[PDB]
Amino acid sequence: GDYIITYRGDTRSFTEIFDKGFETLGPSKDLYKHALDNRAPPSDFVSTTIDPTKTISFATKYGQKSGYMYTMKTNHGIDVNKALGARSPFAAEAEIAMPGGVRAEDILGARAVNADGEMWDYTILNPKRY
Amino acid sequence: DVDKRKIKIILNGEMEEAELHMITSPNRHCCLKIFHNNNQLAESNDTDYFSCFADLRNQLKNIIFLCKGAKINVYPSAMSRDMSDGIVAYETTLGQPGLPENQVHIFDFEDKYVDITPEEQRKFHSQWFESLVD
Amino acid sequence: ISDRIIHLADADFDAKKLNVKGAVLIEFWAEWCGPCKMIAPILDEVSEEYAGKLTVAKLNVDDHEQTPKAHGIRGIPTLMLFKDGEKVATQVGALSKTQLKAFLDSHI
Ligand SMILES: [Ca+2]
Ligand SMILES: [Ca+2]
Ligand SMILES: [Ca+2]
Ligand SMILES: [Ca+2]
């Protein structure tokens, strides 16, 4: 039962995320099909990364909007590169796929990021955990 | 929240400017509207904006969209679709895993390999994924 | 790890009072937090430079539940200055060495 830290960029505010966690959009548990196209069929994984710098282009929509970077601690994630190997399509994302999503209780905090990639000087703690 | 963006299209053989509206609603509801000379040509709803855009181009079959999101070899990753609501995608090359330097904004300008259907784009992506296996 | 920094637990507090003598600077922090790492080298230097005049202490919010709640910690790093057991000042967020030294010397 080993826990690890991972990160996610999201446009959704911490008021929602701290309450409801990160939910999936589909029932498919096939990791190969998740990697090919996680909307066809819609997959039962939430994407996170072990590399926090990889969240910023996504959270800002390529330097166009503000957003948030979330930090979490989980023990149920699936290391995609580990499962797929050389044919992992986007190996440099260092993706940890979370089956069935991430409970609100496992989200530790949030730190906002503006469109120019500048972030808060602090992290807001998840009160559902603290 | 409402975001707006002007893009270029080819309509009846002439290049025109069009206006996109992005309306992100609760419950992951993404809505995409396109206006041309202040007439709404179409709209699509989905859970990410790359899907909305593919559906929009499917409704407007006779319009060429001069955008990276229309390019035959562009497609979002699972992570980019999920974390950026589909706004960030990758430009892919056969045999080559996608890299951060290949990331693109789907509504950034593009005029090459964009006169193609969403289905052709999806078929190429499947060929690309398969090309990573030796 | 900073040599002269001490690490607190809930037992080092009785309610909102600190059971540690003298002038004490506490950082509420977490191992996974970027801003907290930004100021770790600044806290290392202060712990060296103020030795004998100030104790620098850390309270890991992932290890200790009672104390962050007692003091309403909502964000990290939170810096909280204590004197003879009592809280005198608080600052939230990473900051420069210049700003931190001004903060300490104005209240000590
Ligand atoms: Ca561990
Ligand atoms: Ca749809
Ligand atoms: Ca290859
Ligand atoms: Ca003084």
Closest CA to B49 of B67, B73, B35, B37: B67
Give residues with Cβ within 8 angstroms of A90, minimum separation 6: A35, B77, B78, B79, B80, B90, B97, B98
Give the whole-angstrom CA distance, residue A119 versus residue B5: 25
Report yes or no on A27 lying in a domain.
yes
Q: How many Cβ atoms are within 10 Å of A1's Cβ, its own excluded?
A: 4
At B38, list the tokens: 């202040």
- If phi > 0 it is left, if psi is from -120 to 50 it is alpha, else beta; for residue C84 that is left
Q: In which domain, by residue range, is A76 found? A: 4-125
Indicate whether C98 belongs to any domain.
yes
By DSSP bridging, strand A4-10 and strand C86-92 are unpaired
Q: In CATH, what number is assigned to the domain containing residue A26?
A: 3.90.210.10
Cβ-defined contact of A111 to C32 (cutoff 8 Å): no
Q: Report the C-alpha gap between B117 and A121 in whole angstroms.
A: 45
Q: Do A25 and B77 touch (CB under 8 A)?
A: no
Residue A10: Cβ within 10 Å count? 22
CA distance B64 to B70: 8
Q: Are A107 and A17 in contact (CB under 8 A)?
A: yes
**In this structure, what DSSP letter does residue B121 have?**
H
Method of elucidation: X-ray
Cβ within 8 Å, pair A125-C32: no
Please answer whether residues C48 and C103 qualify as being in contact, where contact means their C-beta atoms are separated by less than 8 angstroms: no
* R_g over Cα of chain A: 14
Domain count, chain C: 1
- The Å distance, Cα A73 to ligand 1 centre, comes to 9
Domain extents in chain B: 2-131
| DSSP letters for A63-101 | TTS-EEEEEEEES--EEHHHHHGGG-TTGGG-EEEEET-
Specify whether the CB–CB gap between A11 and B24 falls below 8 A.
yes
Nearest residue to C6 (alpha-carbon basis) of C48, C46, C52, C59: C59
* CB within 8 Å: A47 and B82: yes
DSSP state of B67: B
Q: Which residue has the tokens 């041309």?
A: B36
**Chain A closest-CA separation from residue B29 CA (Å):** 11
Q: Rounded to a whole number, what is the distance in Å from the CA of B88 to chain A's nearest CA?
A: 6
- What the block records as the tokens of B64 is 């060429």
Nearest to A87 by CA among B129, B93, B91, B123: B129
Q: What is the CATH number of the domain that holds C93?
A: 3.40.30.10
Q: Do chains C and A touch (3 or more CB pairs under 8 A)?
A: yes
A5: chain C residues, CB-CB within 8 Å: 32
Give C11's DSSP letter: G
In a domain, A130, yes or no: no
Identify each DSSP E strand in C1-108 by its residue range.
6-7, 13-14, 17-18, 23-29, 55-60, 75-76, 78-83, 86-92
Instruction: Kindly identify the ligand whose nearest atom is closest to the C-alpha of B133.
Output: 3
Q: Is residue C83 part of a domain?
A: yes
Partnered with residue B96 across adjacent β-strands are B93
| β partners of residue A47 | A97
Q: Is residue C1 part of a domain?
A: no
| Residue C84 in marked binding region | no
Going from the Cα of C52 to the center of ligand 4, the distance in angstroms, rounded, reads 15
Task: Report the domain count for chain A.
Answer: 1
Q: Is residue C77 within 8 angstroms of chain A, CB to CB?
A: yes
Kindly state the tokens that stand for C27. 């950082």
Which residue out of C18, C23, C25, C36 is catalytically annotated? C36
Substitution target in A19, A81, A93, A95 with the highest count of B β-carbons within 10 Å is A93
Q: How far apart are CA A23 and CA A19, in angstroms?
A: 11
Q: Which residues contact A54 (CB under 8 A, 6 or more apart)?
A: A7, A92, A93, A94, B79, B100
What are phi and psi for residue C52, nearest 5 degrees? Answer: 90, -15
CB contact under 8 A, B78 and A34: yes
Token pair 């066809």 in the structure block, residue: A40
Is the dihedral angle over the CA atoms C65, C66, C71, C77 positive or is it negative?
Answer: negative
Give the integer Cα–Cα distance in Å for B94 and C63: 49
Beta-bridge partners for B67: B109
Residues from chain B that touch A35, judged by Cβ atoms under 8 A, are 78, 129
